[PDB]
Design a protein around this nucleic acid. Structure first.
Ligand SMILES: Nc1ccn([C@H]2C[C@H](O)[C@@H](COP(=O)(O)OP(=O)(O)OP(=O)(O)O)O2)c(=O)n1
Ligand SMILES: [Cl-]
Ligand SMILES: [Cl-]
Ligand SMILES: [Mg+2]
Ligand SMILES: [Mg+2]
Ligand code: NA
Ligand code: NA
Ligand code: NA
Length: 327
DNA sequence: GTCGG
DNA sequence: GCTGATGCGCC
DNA sequence: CCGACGGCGCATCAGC
């Protein structure tokens, strides 16, 4: 039981319908902003009107909140749940590497279930095949206890490649979450800055060492600065194995560490809303820089940054600890 | 879907 | 190959 | 067919 749990689950469910079925990404974003502001609200919502006062709730969402508050359900969602087609499209998007577009296509050709995907593996790309192979594993959360073991493995192996590397586990882990959806690792090295890429293969050396020791087991995508893949803790004899887990590693210029760690710590909705506040203050924020906004459209050169807090400072936000950036 | 130019 | 658009994903 | 909305890495396709 969470305070306005009913409402936020309804809106979250509709968000996912819009993104996955209607391919209406802004409606997705609207529903999520509403869910977010309502989850922050410290009172029980008693009407649509009350909700309408909040930023990002308008007429239509207020009417839905009135309906749900009177009846305990939403007709629109009942119909969507009874629609086999919608339900298949939505389910398939949960496979890593099947987005809304591929899900729709698969369903159009009558591929609607996990069994159907295994029968039509030849229709899937490498990434999708891996998402399917570990589907059950990727559904499951990682207890913090395991995240700590995984961190120890990563930091130790990284140190063995070169002790000038610094690896920081971000995402929900950094936000103090008791369980995590995956492992996000921010990487820096003194040879890679906004000025110069001096050393080649900097990210590659880490990935290959983590592969050598059989921690990283599969690669979904890979470039010079981002690794997206799979890893697994070692297990003991006749102990059942650990689930395979999703891992993301991001290599950021050392001199842009605070912008990177801010981005990688999230949450996602926090980030979008911090970046949104930046815009209405005449700045733009990415994982590399905070820049002031001109007029021609263009951003100006990066502003100096010496902490996560300095970024909040530019935009008139009081600092938020990582744990206070979750939903 | 909402908000604001 | 390029530029630009799309589809996958990340926080 | 009021348009903006947060921003970008990697992979792949279109029209050169
Ligand atoms: N668990 C199973 C069952 C059957 N098959 C085989 C038999 C067929 O050669 C092919 C599937 O053909 P179907 O058209 O029966 O499979 P569909 O998934 O299309 O049938 P449905 O309409 O029931 O979804 O795969 C399989 O690989 N695995
Ligand atoms: Cl939309
Ligand atoms: Cl920085
Ligand atoms: Mg994560
Ligand atoms: Mg996430
Ligand atoms: Na409102
Ligand atoms: Na997916
Ligand atoms: Na991740």
């Amino acid at each position: 039981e969470t305070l306005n749990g009913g409402i936020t689950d309804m809106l979250t469910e509709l968000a996912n319908f819009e993104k996955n079925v209607s391919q209406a990404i802004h409606k997705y974003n609207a529903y999520r902003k509403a869910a977010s502001v309502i989850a922050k609200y410290p009172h029980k919502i008693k009407s649509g009107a009350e909700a309408k006062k909040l930023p990002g709730v308008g007429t239509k969402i207020a009417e839905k909140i009135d309906e749900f508050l009177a009846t305990g359900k939403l007709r629109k969602l009942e119909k969507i749940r009874q629609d086999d087609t919608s339900s298949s499209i939505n389910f398939l998007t949960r496979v890593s590497g099947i987005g809304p577009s591929a899900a729709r296509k698969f369903v159009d050709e009558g591929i609607k279930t996990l069994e159907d995907l295994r029968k039509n593996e030849d229709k899937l790309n490498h990434h999708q095949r891996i998402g399917l192979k570990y589907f059950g594993d990727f559904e499951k959360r990682i207890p913090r206890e395991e995240m700590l073991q995984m961190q120890d493995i990563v930091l130790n192996e990284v140190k063995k490649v070169d002790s000038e590397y610094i690896a920081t586990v971000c995402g929900s882990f950094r936000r103090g979450a008791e369980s995590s959806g995956d492992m996000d690792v921010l990487l820096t090295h003194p040879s890679f800055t906004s000025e110069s890429t001096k050393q080649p293969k900097l990210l590659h050396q880490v990935v290959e060492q983590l592969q050598k020791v059989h921690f990283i087991t599969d690669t979904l995508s890979k470039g010079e600065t981002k690794f997206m893949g799979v890893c697994q803790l070692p297990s003991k004899n006749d102990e059942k194995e650990y689930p395979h887990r999703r891992i993301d590693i991001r290599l950021i210029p050392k001199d842009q560490y605070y912008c990177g760690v801010l981005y990688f710590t999230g949450s996602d909705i926090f980030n979008k809303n911090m970046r949104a506040h930046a815009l209405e203050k005449g700045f733009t924020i990415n994982e590399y820089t905070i820049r002031p906004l001109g007029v021609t459209g263009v951003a100006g050169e990066p502003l100096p940054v010496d902490s996560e807090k300095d970024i909040f400072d530019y935009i008139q936000w009081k600092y938020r600890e990582p744990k206070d950036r979750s939903e």
